[PDB]
Structure formats: structure tokens, C-alpha cells
Amino acid sequence: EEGPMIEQLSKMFFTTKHRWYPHGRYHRCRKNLNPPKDR
Amino acid sequence: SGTWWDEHLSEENVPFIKQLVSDEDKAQLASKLCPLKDEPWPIHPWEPGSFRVGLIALKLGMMPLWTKDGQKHVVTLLQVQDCHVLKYTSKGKMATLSVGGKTVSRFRKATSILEFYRELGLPPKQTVKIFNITDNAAIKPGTPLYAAHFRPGQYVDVTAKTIGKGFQGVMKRWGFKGQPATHGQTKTHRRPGAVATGDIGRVWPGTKMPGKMGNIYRTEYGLKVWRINTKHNIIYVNGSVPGHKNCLVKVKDSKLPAYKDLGKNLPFPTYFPDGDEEELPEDLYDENVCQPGAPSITFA
Amino acid sequence: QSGGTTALPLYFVGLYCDKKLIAEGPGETVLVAEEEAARVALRKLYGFTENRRPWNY
Amino acid sequence: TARGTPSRFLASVLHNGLGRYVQQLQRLSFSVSRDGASSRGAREFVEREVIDFARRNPGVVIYVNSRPCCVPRVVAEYLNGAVREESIHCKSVEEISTLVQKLADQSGLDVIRIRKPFHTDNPSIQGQWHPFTNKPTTFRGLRPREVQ
Amino acid sequence: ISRKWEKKNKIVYPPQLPGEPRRPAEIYHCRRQIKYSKDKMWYLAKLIRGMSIDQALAQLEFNDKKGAKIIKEVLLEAQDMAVRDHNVEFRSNLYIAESTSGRGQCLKRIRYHGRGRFGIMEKVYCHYFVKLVEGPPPPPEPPKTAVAHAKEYIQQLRSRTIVHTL
Amino acid sequence: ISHGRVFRRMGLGPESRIHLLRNLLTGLVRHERIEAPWARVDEMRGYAEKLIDYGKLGDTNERAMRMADFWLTEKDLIPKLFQVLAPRYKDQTGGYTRMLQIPNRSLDRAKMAVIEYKGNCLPPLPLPRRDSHLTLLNQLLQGLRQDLRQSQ
Amino acid sequence: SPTELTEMRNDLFNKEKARQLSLTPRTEKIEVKHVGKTDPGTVFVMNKNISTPYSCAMHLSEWYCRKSILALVDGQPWDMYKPLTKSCEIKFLTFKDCDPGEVNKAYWRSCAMMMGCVIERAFNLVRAPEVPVISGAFCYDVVLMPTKENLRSFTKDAHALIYKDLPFETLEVEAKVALEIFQHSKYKVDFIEEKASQNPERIVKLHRIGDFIDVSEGPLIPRTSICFQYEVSAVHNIRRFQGVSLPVHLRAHFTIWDKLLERSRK
Amino acid sequence: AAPKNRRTIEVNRCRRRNPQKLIKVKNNIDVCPECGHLKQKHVLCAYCYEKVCKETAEIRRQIGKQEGGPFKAPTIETVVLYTGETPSEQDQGKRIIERDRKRPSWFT
Ligand SMILES: [Mg+2]
Ligand SMILES: [Mg+2]
Ligand SMILES: [Mg+2]
Ligand SMILES: [Zn+2]
């Protein structure tokens, strides 16, 4: 279901099959959950 | 898969279920034994460019066969068991047809396969080889294909797996000469010496190296047929055949340029026992094959 | 309209008042686009658009 | 070192520039030491500059702890809640005065990357640009390759 | 030396009010000095994390590993302490929440090579911690379906503003 | 390569493995129960099958006598064998030895099993008792069979 | 107004539960005994107005909670989610037993109740006829043409109800409240009257499944998750329905399932 | 042959954390109808096996006590009894070997 689902999502959004996969906890924690509110 | 069936059955329902399964399979086979009686779709005549459906027999063993000229010729054995059509699909690049073979128990199979084989008659088969057939010959699913489909004096190709030798070394996998026994080897007798050059710090893809030998489908072209059997539905093909004994093999028409326009005398669609066709003898022989029981040869 | 049945459309729904458009606004879907157009029309009617006057201090 | 340091967009605490101007500096607590050579500047300030600084802007209250301290510090609170506890160890009177003036002039906003020195609330006046701009419209809006 | 897992069992919380949740009881227990490695202990811990205590014991009773019996005994002792000291009625309503395994105090020995050399032979010791929380085990985080991916993509595309300008 | 190869190598050669199998067979004939690895268990079971066959062939037969004298090192189990395990199973044909399985060894963790001759005086083993006939699926199958029988 | 009727029935059920629970004497404890085949002679000191054999199963191990279906107290059958009274022996029943007849009857009754609930939620009932287990199909007459689409919709509804996973709340209530809850359908009224006349008193057992309530006799399956497979064979003649279902831990096979369906199609 | 670059902690973790190396969970643990000691499929129980082993050991000890010295192996069958229980009329010549014990709830 992983491969077929990713292929369907890519064909629907016309994007690559690389950004669909998740990332490790390193990048998850490096992400800022409280960004600076602008405007 | 899930939980095997033989888990919640007492010591009295196992044989009853076995007998019921056998009776149902036999009844389905007997009901499907009549293809012409049921809607067989319009049958077309032979054409220059058109192929026919193949068979999927079992490689039993091997035996010799002497011709009228007095020469030994190895011959294989191919038992055509059931061999029914599953479905039909039109335009890919050309029409296609699925064919089965042996009768495998319907207990260790997927639910989707079980439903697909329940939509049609017959029990689930083992393998399913798709043949690239033309739009001319189009047989309806559920029809049988005995050994009578082929006839002597015809080149039929065969393809199947091979006796896999597992992850073998180098010599047995590619035939390398290895290294000598002495003068002055100490630990080099079957290993691969140099890879390829020196400055190249890579390895040429596809280079001969240790790997899993055999266990792959390989087709053989140019195999003449000598004799065929109608009672047991056996096909005797010249030369060896890939795959071990009691192994399913895919058989179909040849493809060489010298053997392409010669199916005029052969049945364009498939042999039909029900006829209106004049049954054939016990076994059709060849023009250059010593029949069993004929007088001794004489080159005088 | 941009695209169509591509899961990422962009329709520019308008509001013709006797062959005289009073406002308009884009939106993801058709109903959302019409709602945004009606909201922009109400804004223009109330003079609350971004082109209003700042203030008088 | 911006990637390894938090940032914040430029903005005000209450838009004081529009209406009345409110002093962002709240209070100031000086921890001067009576006996000690590490607070002569703070002492001279509290003596002959703190009064003038307080009278120049009555919208700020200042305290004088005057406790046995080894290092004089200054707590500069703000309305938003930020606190700038700086130290004035060994500093001339002019330096301390300039530091106090700078603290009173600045706001409680953090001292990090300001990013984009401009906060335009309504940057679009003639209509924000969109892909469907500076383009015509055919008859009946017939997309290309359309018969009826 | 640093013993803390044994001291955490003495934490005391204030009395809860009627309008408050049940607060699942936490358990702490560990055995010190275990003649065993640490990688295998961590493997066993990872194997026994989301499962309950019954399934954990069932898997341990059929795990061809020296540490299996040690972990089973530790879990049995923890369950007994929870049913006796920590005051818990349900014996099967406990699931594993945390499980680690750090090295201990190692010694040193000699191996004697085939020449005038040698190498230090440390006596690898390890430990084992377990945290059993009251109540049934939580369900495993299911895999995000295509709808979740589409929603995340739409949110990422909608939460984008112009760059390098006003 | 080992395509269609029988006799799993155990000891340091054919002699060692056959001697071990003979010792296991002697121990089983003496006690009627041995805990050995699965491989050795099945090998000794297959050997005891032919041993019982030879014992059933006859006692006066010189071939069977020599086989019993060879495969039995103690030399005291030949009469017990010939006079107990041959007449007792005078009705059976190939229903000897009942193989099962042991959880594992507490030392090196090895797959062990148990084999014994049927009808022994020792206590019975916990054989895998199939599900009773009064269950749901069993009752449904019985009803289906009754309906099929009444259909005629 | 079926929604209002169901709401009133649920309100009456909740009021009856509150009335039954109000008589608790500040939680009175008792010492119940357990006489089983494994791990004797264990006992339990549970409650007498709230505790259920499920609590004893949990105290023992999760295996019993996942396998136990009925608890035999004094030789009589009981439910897993039902308050017990009078300290007596306790037992456990599963599908793989020596005489699992009570479990089979309970499963049949639960399947009949689920079929009735699905029929009611589809788009008047009469009762729950107790058909033997050997019949190979549970029946549930309903007073009011079905096709393959209707059967598929009923099967989908049953699968959704099973996936919902809800407990079976039981109550031993007199005939007065039973008639008050069913003061519309005359068939159910007559059934309740007959059940009350059969018993020495007016006590009658009830059942509740979220927004569905029905009267029966023997116990049922606690959770609906125990029912793995579920199908609807066909309909016969006021209209008698049919169906087959297999529980968890006894997953037969697609072929056996189709054979059982064909056998039930009668 | 020697390591040219030490493997990083990330590489080591990725190597020692893949599902191929992790212990594969098993789902072949049922409940034994006898003594409920959670047995495994296609495998005998534990407590029952221990009881059978103890009984066989006791029977062998009794046989040795009755047989005496080694190198015997009589050519007669055996019959096990218990407290009381008159010998079966069918097995009269078979040597009886027993001492003192009560028939359990699982022996015929
Ligand atoms: Mg050579
Ligand atoms: Mg050499
Ligand atoms: Mg070896
Ligand atoms: Zn047991």
C-alpha cells in the first residue's frame, strides 16, 4: 500500500516520490513549532 | 497467510471435507469437459499472420527414441494435465490469454485468487502464464487443452525454471579455469584472480562474480516433436527441457523465421474432442520414427 | 478558471448586477469562490476595502 | 549565526507611533555599594545624574537599593515584560549615563535578528498581483481549443 | 555510582479532587549488576515496549536468550510490588511504558595473544529498567493515509507567503 | 549442493553418526524414551522402523539375528525385542514410534523431541488433542453432512 | 418518530440502571470462590453489585479475558459484563471445551440480536425464535422484496456494527418496565408476557446495544468484536430472515465459508 | 583490511536497528487446557511434561530396584499399578512393578 499510495499521490499532485516519505526525529525536532507571526 | 484450515476440525470432519472437496472438483471438471456444447465464440480459419494458444505440461522424465535412419535421439516427456483458460484481455500491444496447469489445493491461496477462481469453474491452478496471441484465435475461458493441440513434425518452444544451484562460486557459475593446484598456489584454486585493470577504481557492472546460479526462466528455441499421446495426454519433445522433474513448463509455438508459416495443417484454434471432428488414433507417429512393434529396420 | 479536476483549481467567481459587475474574488472551489466574491462585494459596499482612508489624527 | 539563533519580525508593542507615545521603559533598580571600589561610577551617577534623568521623563520610576553588593547591576524592565539585567562594573559616569539613556530609549523587544526592517501592514493598494493579471479575456471566455 | 530508579518509587503526589481523572499509577523497578551485555538487553527492551505484561511474559517464556529469564523475573517482581506496595487490584491491566539497559561497572582481564602482546578483556556488566503504567495499553500509531498526506500538502501550500519583499 | 540428499551429517563421519544412532536405538529399546535433537530423533525413529521390521521378519532367520546382534551392543535386548515388540505389533504394519517435540534445552537451547513405541506401560504423553466435535464449526459440519446424506 | 422512540427507550434503560444501582449499600464486599480446571483453588473478593467475572478474568490474566465467553456459576450460565450476587463458585467457558453448548447458544442468540438490530437500522419485529445450532442458520422473523443489494447493505451494516465494538449491557427487570419500554409493538408485548409467565416471577432479562434494546432468554456475547465473520444468506417467508457468522479464534476458510452459506441458503 | 574511517553513531544505529536484525515477534502461544501454563503450538506443555518425566523417572527407579543388578532385560512385558487395584485378569504373567502411589487424574 505504501508504494501504490505514494505513486497515486505523486500522480495526483504531479510531484516526485521523494518528498512523500517521512523524515527521522532529527529533522522533526529541528523544526520550529513556534514560528514568528508576521502580519 | 492466516490460520491454516486443519486447526479447528475434529477427527471425523477431516475426511468428510476431503471427500467433499474431491467430489466438487471432479464435478466441476466433468461439467467443464464440454467446451463446444457451451458458447465457444465464433471460430475463424487460418491466416498468414496469427498464433495459437500454448500448453503448460509437466516435465516427467526422459527416454530415448530411435528414428528410421538408425540413430539415437533424446526425447523429453510432457504431461498435459487439464490446462484450462482463465480469462481473456484485449488491447496492450496484442491480445493475451491466461492458462493454468496442475490442480493445487484451494486452501493455501489468497482470498482474491479464491474469489477469482470461484467466479469461474474448475479449481485453482498452480501457475498462470500469459501468452501473446493475435486477435484471430480467441477461445472462451474454461475450455480444456489436451495434448492433441500439437502434432508431430512441428517445432515447439519450451521455457521453465532451472535446477538452481544456489549461490555458487565462480567456476561452476561461469566456467572459469581457476588457478593451478601447484607451482605455486597456496590458497588460490577456485577464487577469481584480477577484476578488471588497475587504475579503474570501480567494477564494470555485469562482471562475472559469484552469484545465484540457475533458478530462473530460460527458453529453448528449436525443439522438434516426435510422438504424442491422446489417452494420457503426453507430449514427447526432442532434446532436453529446462526445469527439474515434475516441474511445470510453459509451451507454445516457435518463433524462428524458418518455422512461422506452416500452421496450415495444424488446428488454428484448438483441438476439440467433441466432433464432428473424427477422433485420432491412440497415438500419432512420425514419418521418421521407429514405431513400437514394427519389424526390425533393414538398410538393404 | 485555472486547471480543472486537478485537486488544485482556482476559479474567479464574479457577481453581475444587471450586466454590471460590482466585485469579485477567487477561491479554491466554486462555492467558496462565490462566498469570497460576496464578501468582497459586501466590503466594497461598506467601504471597508484596503483602499479606504487611514484616519484623521 | 542566524540559523542557530532565534529571529523575530519587526513590529511594535502597541503602535504607539499612531496615537500617543508611551515610554516602553518601566522601572530601574540600581544595586550600588556604599563601601567598595567597584561602584564609584554608579555612586557618582546616583549622586549627580539620576535626579536629572528621572526629572527629564516623569513617566518612569527609579529605585536605589544601596545594599552590600560586589558587582553593581541594573534591572531595566519593560511594559511587555522583558527584563534587561545588565552590569555596570567599573564604568565612567558618562558611559553609565549613555547606557541608561539607551535603555530608556529602546523597547522591551528582544535583541535578535530583526529580519526585514519594515512592517507594512497593507502593502497592497492597487490590488495584489495574481497569475490572472495583465491578461485579456476572449469572447465568452472560451478556453483554447473550444468549439462551443 | 548513581541510584535513582529505586528512589523514584517514593514520589508522593497531593490528594486528588473528585473532579479529576484517575491518573494511571506508574511503577519503577530495576536490577543492578547483571552478567550480560547491553545490546541484547536493549533488543529485548525494544521487543517489549508497546505490548502488555501478559504478552511480554508470554514472549519472554519462549525467547532463547539468557536475559529472557532475568527480564521475566524482573517483571514478576515489579507486578508483585505493584499489587502489594503500590496498591493495584488488576494484575493484567499493566503495560510497559519505558525500558532501557545501560552498562555497569566492568572489570579487566587478559587474553594472551599468540605473541609477546595481549589485550584488555573487560567484564561487560549491564542493568535493566522497566516502567509499568496502570490501565490498558494504548493503541499503536496507525500509518497516515493518503488523505493525511494530501491535507499536509495543502496546508504547506497554503501557509506560504511572498519572500524578499514587503 | 544437496539436491535430494538424505542422512544428515552429525558426527565426525559415517562411522561416528551410525554408532551414535545405534547407541540411541539401544537406549530406546532399553527404556522406550529418549530426549535427543530433532535430527537424531527422526534418524533413530527411521532406523527403529526397519529394526522392528527385521524383528518381525522372524527369529530363526540368520539375517534378522545378525542385525539384532549388531544393532544392539548390550546383547541382552535381543530376546526382549524379538519376544515383545514383534508379537505385540503382530497386527500393525507401519504405525510405530510416536514423535513429538520438546520446548528447548535449558543449556544451549536445542530443538529436542521424544519418541517411543506405542502400547508402552509408561504414562501417556500430552498428545495434541484435536478440538471436540461439540464445537460450533464441528456442529455446522455435522449438520451439513447430515443434510447431504438426507438429500439422497 | 423512530428516533424519539429509541431515545425514550434509552432513557428508560438509563433510569432502570440508576434505580438498580441506587440500592447499593455503600459498596458491600463479598468473598466469591472459583472452582476451575486450571490454577486452583484460587478465589476472589469482588463486589456484589458492580463487579463482573470480567474483573476476575483481568485479575487472572488477559488470556481468559480474550477467550472467556461465559462464566458458569452454580452450573448456570452468566455474562461477562453482568453483576454477580451470592458468593458461589466461578468457572470459565470457551469455544474449545468438552461441552461448549451454552457458548454456542449464546453466540446464536447474539447473532440473532445483531441481525434484528441491523434489520431495524436498515430502513416491525415480532420476536427472536430460538433455532438449534445444527440448523446452520439463525432466524429472526420480522413483520412488514430483498435482493443482492439489500443483503450486501445488511452485511456492511453488520460489519460496521462489529467494528464499532460495543458491550452488551444486561439487566434483570420485571415485566412492568419491559412493557413500558415496548408499549407499541404487540408482538413484543406478548413475548414479554409469555416470558414472565414462564418464570416464577415477573423478572425478565433485557439487553442493550448502544441505541438498540431487545428481550431474550439466555446470555449473549459480551463484545461484538468476538464475531469475526458475518453474512446474510437469503430471506424466506412474516418474513423469515437467515444468516451465518463465525466467531474469532475459529477462522475457517473462504471455501468452508461459501459451503456454509450455501447450506444455510434454505 | 583495517578501518579507514570509524563508523559514525548514526550509521551504527541504522545498522543495529533495522527490522531484519530486530527480534521478530511470534504469535504461536496458546493456552494449555491442562494447568494453563501457556503452551506453544506443535509443542507439548511444560508442567505436564515435567510430571511425565518425574513419573517415568520414578518408574525406572522402581524397575531398577526390582530388577537388581545391570545386564538383565527380561523377555516379559510390564504393567504399572497403584495403591490397591487388583491386577488385571488379562495381564497375569506380566511382571508387576510398583510400590506406593495413587493414580492421578490423567493416567489410564
Ligand atoms: Mg582446474
Ligand atoms: Mg594447496
Ligand atoms: Mg559437525
Ligand atoms: Zn499443561
PDB file of N, CA and C in Angstrom, chain B residues 108-142:
ATOM      1  N   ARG B 108      -4.365 -23.135   0.602  1.00  0.00           N
ATOM      2  CA  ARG B 108      -3.218 -22.256   0.809  1.00  0.00           C
ATOM      3  C   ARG B 108      -3.116 -21.286  -0.364  1.00  0.00           C
ATOM      4  N   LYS B 109      -4.121 -20.419  -0.478  1.00  0.00           N
ATOM      5  CA  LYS B 109      -4.173 -19.424  -1.538  1.00  0.00           C
ATOM      6  C   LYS B 109      -4.761 -18.136  -0.980  1.00  0.00           C
ATOM      7  N   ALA B 110      -4.607 -17.058  -1.744  1.00  0.00           N
ATOM      8  CA  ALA B 110      -5.115 -15.759  -1.334  1.00  0.00           C
ATOM      9  C   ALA B 110      -6.621 -15.678  -1.552  1.00  0.00           C
ATOM     10  N   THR B 111      -7.273 -14.829  -0.754  1.00  0.00           N
ATOM     11  CA  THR B 111      -8.719 -14.670  -0.867  1.00  0.00           C
ATOM     12  C   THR B 111      -9.109 -14.142  -2.241  1.00  0.00           C
ATOM     13  N   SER B 112      -8.316 -13.220  -2.791  1.00  0.00           N
ATOM     14  CA  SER B 112      -8.609 -12.692  -4.120  1.00  0.00           C
ATOM     15  C   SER B 112      -8.525 -13.788  -5.175  1.00  0.00           C
ATOM     16  N   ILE B 113      -7.492 -14.629  -5.101  1.00  0.00           N
ATOM     17  CA  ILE B 113      -7.358 -15.726  -6.055  1.00  0.00           C
ATOM     18  C   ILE B 113      -8.518 -16.701  -5.905  1.00  0.00           C
ATOM     19  N   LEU B 114      -8.918 -16.982  -4.663  1.00  0.00           N
ATOM     20  CA  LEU B 114     -10.036 -17.889  -4.436  1.00  0.00           C
ATOM     21  C   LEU B 114     -11.322 -17.332  -5.030  1.00  0.00           C
ATOM     22  N   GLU B 115     -11.575 -16.035  -4.844  1.00  0.00           N
ATOM     23  CA  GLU B 115     -12.769 -15.427  -5.423  1.00  0.00           C
ATOM     24  C   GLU B 115     -12.716 -15.455  -6.946  1.00  0.00           C
ATOM     25  N   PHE B 116     -11.553 -15.144  -7.523  1.00  0.00           N
ATOM     26  CA  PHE B 116     -11.424 -15.145  -8.976  1.00  0.00           C
ATOM     27  C   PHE B 116     -11.669 -16.535  -9.548  1.00  0.00           C
ATOM     28  N   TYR B 117     -11.146 -17.571  -8.889  1.00  0.00           N
ATOM     29  CA  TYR B 117     -11.341 -18.934  -9.363  1.00  0.00           C
ATOM     30  C   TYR B 117     -12.724 -19.478  -9.026  1.00  0.00           C
ATOM     31  N   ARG B 118     -13.430 -18.862  -8.077  1.00  0.00           N
ATOM     32  CA  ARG B 118     -14.812 -19.237  -7.810  1.00  0.00           C
ATOM     33  C   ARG B 118     -15.766 -18.610  -8.817  1.00  0.00           C
ATOM     34  N   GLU B 119     -15.464 -17.395  -9.284  1.00  0.00           N
ATOM     35  CA  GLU B 119     -16.270 -16.792 -10.341  1.00  0.00           C
ATOM     36  C   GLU B 119     -16.341 -17.696 -11.566  1.00  0.00           C
ATOM     37  N   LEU B 120     -15.287 -18.465 -11.820  1.00  0.00           N
ATOM     38  CA  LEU B 120     -15.244 -19.431 -12.907  1.00  0.00           C
ATOM     39  C   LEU B 120     -15.272 -20.844 -12.339  1.00  0.00           C
ATOM     40  N   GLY B 121     -15.507 -21.811 -13.217  1.00  0.00           N
ATOM     41  CA  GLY B 121     -15.472 -23.200 -12.825  1.00  0.00           C
ATOM     42  C   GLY B 121     -14.050 -23.667 -12.563  1.00  0.00           C
ATOM     43  N   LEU B 122     -13.927 -24.976 -12.345  1.00  0.00           N
ATOM     44  CA  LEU B 122     -12.632 -25.610 -12.131  1.00  0.00           C
ATOM     45  C   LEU B 122     -12.023 -25.146 -10.812  1.00  0.00           C
ATOM     46  N   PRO B 123     -11.031 -25.858 -10.285  1.00  0.00           N
ATOM     47  CA  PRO B 123     -10.367 -25.411  -9.061  1.00  0.00           C
ATOM     48  C   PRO B 123      -9.187 -24.512  -9.380  1.00  0.00           C
ATOM     49  N   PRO B 124      -8.598 -23.869  -8.373  1.00  0.00           N
ATOM     50  CA  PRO B 124      -7.437 -23.010  -8.636  1.00  0.00           C
ATOM     51  C   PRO B 124      -6.233 -23.824  -9.085  1.00  0.00           C
ATOM     52  N   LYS B 125      -5.507 -23.282 -10.058  1.00  0.00           N
ATOM     53  CA  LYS B 125      -4.341 -23.947 -10.617  1.00  0.00           C
ATOM     54  C   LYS B 125      -3.082 -23.465  -9.895  1.00  0.00           C
ATOM     55  N   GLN B 126      -1.916 -23.881 -10.386  1.00  0.00           N
ATOM     56  CA  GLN B 126      -0.638 -23.510  -9.764  1.00  0.00           C
ATOM     57  C   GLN B 126      -0.121 -22.202 -10.355  1.00  0.00           C
ATOM     58  N   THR B 127       0.353 -22.249 -11.595  1.00  0.00           N
ATOM     59  CA  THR B 127       0.909 -21.085 -12.267  1.00  0.00           C
ATOM     60  C   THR B 127      -0.079 -20.538 -13.293  1.00  0.00           C
ATOM     61  N   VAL B 128       0.196 -19.317 -13.750  1.00  0.00           N
ATOM     62  CA  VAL B 128      -0.637 -18.655 -14.746  1.00  0.00           C
ATOM     63  C   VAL B 128       0.261 -17.928 -15.738  1.00  0.00           C
ATOM     64  N   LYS B 129       0.521 -18.559 -16.879  1.00  0.00           N
ATOM     65  CA  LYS B 129       1.378 -17.993 -17.913  1.00  0.00           C
ATOM     66  C   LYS B 129       0.520 -17.286 -18.953  1.00  0.00           C
ATOM     67  N   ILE B 130       0.850 -16.029 -19.231  1.00  0.00           N
ATOM     68  CA  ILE B 130       0.122 -15.230 -20.209  1.00  0.00           C
ATOM     69  C   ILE B 130       0.808 -15.367 -21.561  1.00  0.00           C
ATOM     70  N   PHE B 131       0.031 -15.705 -22.586  1.00  0.00           N
ATOM     71  CA  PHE B 131       0.540 -15.879 -23.939  1.00  0.00           C
ATOM     72  C   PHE B 131       0.111 -14.705 -24.807  1.00  0.00           C
ATOM     73  N   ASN B 132       1.022 -14.246 -25.663  1.00  0.00           N
ATOM     74  CA  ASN B 132       0.750 -13.133 -26.571  1.00  0.00           C
ATOM     75  C   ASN B 132       0.155 -13.702 -27.852  1.00  0.00           C
ATOM     76  N   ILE B 133      -1.172 -13.742 -27.908  1.00  0.00           N
ATOM     77  CA  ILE B 133      -1.887 -14.278 -29.053  1.00  0.00           C
ATOM     78  C   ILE B 133      -2.453 -13.123 -29.867  1.00  0.00           C
ATOM     79  N   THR B 134      -2.795 -13.413 -31.121  1.00  0.00           N
ATOM     80  CA  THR B 134      -3.366 -12.413 -32.008  1.00  0.00           C
ATOM     81  C   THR B 134      -4.873 -12.304 -31.776  1.00  0.00           C
ATOM     82  N   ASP B 135      -5.501 -11.353 -32.472  1.00  0.00           N
ATOM     83  CA  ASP B 135      -6.936 -11.143 -32.328  1.00  0.00           C
ATOM     84  C   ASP B 135      -7.754 -12.214 -33.037  1.00  0.00           C
ATOM     85  N   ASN B 136      -7.141 -12.981 -33.939  1.00  0.00           N
ATOM     86  CA  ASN B 136      -7.859 -14.019 -34.668  1.00  0.00           C
ATOM     87  C   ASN B 136      -8.349 -15.105 -33.720  1.00  0.00           C
ATOM     88  N   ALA B 137      -7.451 -15.996 -33.309  1.00  0.00           N
ATOM     89  CA  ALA B 137      -7.818 -17.079 -32.406  1.00  0.00           C
ATOM     90  C   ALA B 137      -8.172 -16.515 -31.036  1.00  0.00           C
ATOM     91  N   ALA B 138      -9.406 -16.755 -30.596  1.00  0.00           N
ATOM     92  CA  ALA B 138      -9.885 -16.275 -29.298  1.00  0.00           C
ATOM     93  C   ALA B 138     -10.814 -17.339 -28.725  1.00  0.00           C
ATOM     94  N   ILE B 139     -10.286 -18.160 -27.823  1.00  0.00           N
ATOM     95  CA  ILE B 139     -11.053 -19.227 -27.193  1.00  0.00           C
ATOM     96  C   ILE B 139     -11.679 -18.695 -25.913  1.00  0.00           C
ATOM     97  N   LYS B 140     -12.886 -19.164 -25.614  1.00  0.00           N
ATOM     98  CA  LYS B 140     -13.577 -18.719 -24.413  1.00  0.00           C
ATOM     99  C   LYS B 140     -12.937 -19.354 -23.179  1.00  0.00           C
ATOM    100  N   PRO B 141     -12.870 -18.635 -22.056  1.00  0.00           N
ATOM    101  CA  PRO B 141     -12.301 -19.232 -20.843  1.00  0.00           C
ATOM    102  C   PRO B 141     -13.070 -20.472 -20.413  1.00  0.00           C
ATOM    103  N   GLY B 142     -12.394 -21.312 -19.631  1.00  0.00           N
ATOM    104  CA  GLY B 142     -12.987 -22.525 -19.113  1.00  0.00           C
ATOM    105  C   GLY B 142     -12.911 -23.725 -20.031  1.00  0.00           C
TER     106      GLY B 142
END
